[PDB]
Structure formats: structure tokens, C-alpha cells
Design a protein around this ligand. Structure first.
Ligand SMILES: [Cl-]
Ligand SMILES: [Cl-]
Ligand SMILES: [Pt+2]
Ligand SMILES: [Pt+2]
Ligand SMILES: [Pt+2]
Ligand SMILES: [Pt+2]
Ligand SMILES: [Pt+2]
Ligand SMILES: [Pt+2]
Length: 128
């Protein structure tokens, strides 16, 4: 699925991301835009043996198990294929675990580089 920004905002809000650990909803929508272009099926297969999965481009070394990545920790306790679902719940729950495991949103390079310090509310502006 490729989400619209307002539809993704509403789905993320239903799952408690607005103000999760002090990150407003627009931050999460912005991260998804620049990680995956709102595409639940996105993958980026890296040269280091790992792969980034789904709408939030969660990596298979620390966070999910794809079976094929050296150094697997599987800290979200999920197969990486669960992060390619059309519904966002597994990606949201794993994103919350990423923050809960010592990280800010700085764990996402696209967030740091394209959302941090910007008008993130533009991504929810005008949404019902
Ligand atoms: Cl829900
Ligand atoms: Cl729901
Ligand atoms: Pt789809
Ligand atoms: Pt949902
Ligand atoms: Pt939901
Ligand atoms: Pt939820
Ligand atoms: Pt949830
Ligand atoms: Pt749900």
C-alpha cells in the first residue's frame, strides 16, 4: 500500500504515536515520507548483509529477523516480513521498541536529515 499523508497520520494517531516519547505526529509522518515514500512494501537490500524493511525502513541487523543477516539481535521479536504488511501496527510497535531501546528518532537517518528542525506539521496540516 502507498499511504496518503493524512491517512497515515490518522493511522499513526490511532496507535498512539502523537507525542510518543515527546515526538509529535508530524515527526512520524515525515519520517515515513522520507524513509519509504509512504510505501508499506519498501525494501532496501544493503551490501552489509542487512535489509531495511517497510514504511519506516527498519533494519534486519538489530530489529527484525530475516534469517540472512549476520549479527541478528531481533530486538522487536518479529520476522522482517511482518514489517511489509499493509496495516502499520507491527512497524509502529517496532518503532516504539526502537525508541524504548535507548534511541531517539535520530535512529532514522531520514528523520535526522529531512525532518529534524523542519515544519513537520506541514505533513499533518489540512488533514481531517
Ligand atoms: Cl487501532
Ligand atoms: Cl484500527
Ligand atoms: Pt500493499
Ligand atoms: Pt490501524
Ligand atoms: Pt489501528
Ligand atoms: Pt495500534
Ligand atoms: Pt498500537
Ligand atoms: Pt490496529
Amino acid at each position: 500500500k502507498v499511504f496518503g499523508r493524512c491517512e497515515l497520520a490518522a493511522a499513526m494517531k490511532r496507535h498512539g504515536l502523537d507525542n510518543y516519547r515527546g515526538y509529535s505526529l508530524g515527526n512520524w509522518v515525515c519520517a515515513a515520507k522520507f524513509e519509504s515514500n509512504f510505501n508499506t512494501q519498501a525494501t532496501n537490500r544493503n551490501t552489509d548483509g542487512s535489509t531495511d524493511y517497510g514504511i519506516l525502513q527498519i533494519n534486519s541487523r538489530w530489529w527484525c529477523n530475516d534469517g540472512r543477516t549476520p549479527g541478528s539481535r531481533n530486538l522487536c521479536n518479529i520476522p522482517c516480513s511482518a514489517l511489509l504488511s499493509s496495516d502499520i501496527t507491527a512497524s509502529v510497535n517496532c518503532a516504539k521498541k526502537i525508541v524504548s531501546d535507548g534511541n531517539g528518532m535520530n535512529a532514522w537517518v531520514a528523520w535526522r536529515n529531512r525532518c529534524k528542525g523542519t515544519d513537520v506539521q506541514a505533513w499533518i496540516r489540512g488533514c481531517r
